[PDB]
Design a protein around this ligand. Sequence first.
Ligand SMILES: OCc1ccccc1O[C@@H]1O[C@H](CO)[C@@H](O)[C@H](O)[C@H]1O
Lengths: 232, 226, 57, 271, 341
Amino acid sequence: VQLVESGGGLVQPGGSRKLSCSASGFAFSSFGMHWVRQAPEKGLEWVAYISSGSGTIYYADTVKGRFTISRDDPKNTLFLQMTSLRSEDTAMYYCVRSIYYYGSSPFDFWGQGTTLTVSSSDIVMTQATSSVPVTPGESVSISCRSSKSLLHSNGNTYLYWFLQRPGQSPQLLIYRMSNLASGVPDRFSGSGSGTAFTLTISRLEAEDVGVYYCMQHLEYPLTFGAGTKLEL
Amino acid sequence: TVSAEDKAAAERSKMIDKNLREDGEKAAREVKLLLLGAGESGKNTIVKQMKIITGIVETHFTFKDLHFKMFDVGAQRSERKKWIHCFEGVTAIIFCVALSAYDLVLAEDEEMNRMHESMKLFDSICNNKWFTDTSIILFLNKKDLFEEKITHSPLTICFPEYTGANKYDEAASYIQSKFEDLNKRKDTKEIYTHFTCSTDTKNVQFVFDAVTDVIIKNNLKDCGLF
Amino acid sequence: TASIAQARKLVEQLKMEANIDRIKVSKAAADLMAYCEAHAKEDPLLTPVPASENPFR
Amino acid sequence: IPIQLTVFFMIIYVLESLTIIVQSSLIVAVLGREWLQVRRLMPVDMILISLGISRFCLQWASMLNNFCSYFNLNYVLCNLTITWEFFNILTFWLNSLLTVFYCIKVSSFTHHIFLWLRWRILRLFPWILLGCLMITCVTIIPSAIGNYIQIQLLENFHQYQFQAHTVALVIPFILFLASTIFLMASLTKQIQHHSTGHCNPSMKARFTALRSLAVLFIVFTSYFLTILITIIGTLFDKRCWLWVWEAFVYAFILMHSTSLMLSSPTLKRIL
Amino acid sequence: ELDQLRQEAEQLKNQIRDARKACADATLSQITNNIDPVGRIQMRTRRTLRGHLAKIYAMHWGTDSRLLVSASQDGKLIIWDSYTTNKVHAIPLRSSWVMTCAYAPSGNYVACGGLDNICSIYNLKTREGNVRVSRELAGHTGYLSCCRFLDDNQIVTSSGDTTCALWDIETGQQTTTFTGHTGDVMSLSLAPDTRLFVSGACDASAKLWDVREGMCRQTFTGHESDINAICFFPNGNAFATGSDDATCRLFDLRADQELMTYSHDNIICGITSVSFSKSGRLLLAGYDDFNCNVWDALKADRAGVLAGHDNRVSCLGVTDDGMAVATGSWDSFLKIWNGSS
Ligand SMILES: OCc1ccccc1O[C@@H]1O[C@H](CO)[C@@H](O)[C@H](O)[C@H]1O
């Protein structure tokens, strides 16, 4: 499964650009597409989303109107046309696949992303833990907090944990706050209820270094957490 | 209240419904012909020339902007009454009978005439409770084998109650009438009888005409006129 | 000798199936009814579940 | 003139009206139940259900109107000629759509564009029903404004009312007649074209369909002719023969409703 | 020799008949004479799953008791979220002729089988979000009537060859062949302990086999027509059979002879599918009267009737928690039935 990206670099402010995610190795049509941005030295923030068949398109309030996200299924491409880039649009951009059905794994795979540099209601997620020193082999816990309860009446809780080890794109650890992802070790686990939730790592490995993010999916203006950084 | 990806899953279900209805409308546009008959009774050659160059064998062929699905079930050796209801709804049953098989006896049992076995199968399939209205395209194959077989051997062995005058025309007419005599529920089922022309093309043309007629009758029944 | 072989296999089949320990039908019926009664309250099919706990409205 | 003739025609009218009402209500019940259970219906069934509700409401309006007129009992809702006119236009449009649907389904053409349009009619048939209802409303609006101006008055207005009413009636009838005529032409062409390929059950079904179409065409053209004579009743027989004329018209409509009774596939399948 | 072998086979059959008669001191009817009756069970169609465009022939419940799998002649295996009527998946079958389907206990695979004599195992969980044909198990020369997964790698399939087969999915080969039925097997049920499985055929008999030994442990008879349905009691030591004769007969494994038969003068048609309830007190059998009937197993009295379909009730299933009853019929509809307090 590949989610490479193209288009970006140095642009002048107030201009226009187009980011192209060239998916390959999986069924484009069945999956929903997400555009998620990360400030160069800061955490993630959700930008845009298109569903299967382009039936529903959602944008963040910050980028509403200026951005247009579309897809070309026959060519298996995801396009983001951005107009009038302000100073805050300079970011690391990722395309994320997310198929939505019972028992699915939304936000399973993330692309490498494009670096865009310009010349100079919503739920809140708080991670007061921030940076924490960790020693390999120990058991650590990362706490995430929600503005309001994310336990929908259907019985599901709606956190998605992502691990971004330094140098490349983040990957999914836990979906629906308690379900282990695919291809990720067993040691990772998630628990909690209500508004304060935790992710527990029973044993710390060399590749578990990096930052962790918690994201909600109850109300569609998705908001990522600050991100707790685990280092040796 | 519906969750965000609960709503997304509902939209996915709607898309799957759209695909399902498109596929169903495409499938209802094709003609499902159930082809069954006695073994070596020209079934293989029939499917061969109307292909126009185990388990169920599905043959797809298009004639004059009409899709045709042909469903050969000769491989199945089990009790047909346990699965024949799967074919309730076929446009027609393309029965094949070896016209030249009025002398040869069954290999398994020598006390039953092969043509008699074909007649028994035809009786079982026409009067089946699952085909009280599905038409039957009957194919009397091996016409040219019978053309030379008649002047040696008589119909008396196959049908003792036969008048005489052992020529092709009256013998074929007698066999045809005897086969359609098994059709108990007349005026609601049709037996389109055709003598196959192994050297010609009109074999599929006759099937097209019969299928068009059955489609017209089914449409009239759907509109309630008939 | 195909008929002989098949009859021999048939004979072995009922020879094997004859030597099964059998219990009185009274005891088996008592066990069946005990299982039915023991899980009677667990089964929402026999005893209707309260509407709140019902996941089908 | 004799009172026994009047009372006899009035009893036959009330019996025809009641049988029309129960027939239409039975169709409403059975076809609505089937539609609710299946959530889908073949277009003949939707046409039959719409025409059933139209016939029920039209017969109720006709009974109320005729009773108010003959008994000279003035009432707020007794005089409802505009409702009867709108509902007559509705039943005419539904009958025309029924005949066009017979046209599209029975015809065995294989043209790509024609079949394109065909499956678009089958898919969007409820939208065609809604279109028939809205064109009925649009066409009946001139009749409503004519009634409003005539009640405000209570010449050119009378001629405008006559033209509006007759065009409202005759617009669906042209489509219905054309569809019926071409269906007869196609069925008879198929009957005559057969040669050495005789199909006795199939020709029997074709002849039965042709006979049913003939019954429907004769009944509906007689109904159209009698309503047209009524529309020209100013220059024709005086409505003093109310009971006999009404009995004639609704005997025609009873034959039409019974024909569509016997032409309903769901009713015979269920029964 | 053949005469002697046949005579001694009849002698052993007579001996086992005598053993069954001796062990039948008192049937299940008298021992449940004073048992409290089930009462009039009334059921409601809590959800109707529409979307099929042909006759539904099979339906299996997921182990989570919420996901459902339905197979129909339109050529599509539809996976439904029964709670919200959402349709999770629509796998396009290679052959539209399907008469059996199964949900793997882990939920990672679905089995499909029909007149192609091939059991297609479809892998739901893939990196690419499309269900693919994980395996095409072939080797049966008759129509596949029932498939049941065991441990995501072994599947038992009963065919029209009068044979059942245990398949190792990874290799695709037939580990064991279960032979002995005179007629073609039409249904197949697995014991809760997955040690044994019972299958009924058209020879009016149902045989109980051990899965790993591969030999017919027991054979049960008493029916007059083909066994179209089989279902294991949740205890694992009993099973019920539905036949074309309008009777459902309950045989337990420890005492071979049948315990009770459920029948009525009104119903004449053939039972298409049978499924027990979690407590085993209720036995729900579909019929050709276009409706299914809930019998009380202990008292053999018809508890209720779920008249909600306009065609043959082809498949019946009960959730593992006993919270729902899926009933799929030839009218292209699946109805989930539940009680009301
Ligand atoms: O009266 C106005 C009128 C104009 C055009 C068509 C029908 C009309 O009127 C209708 O005539 C029918 C036949 O006499 C009666 O049965 C109806 O009750 C009446 O409303």
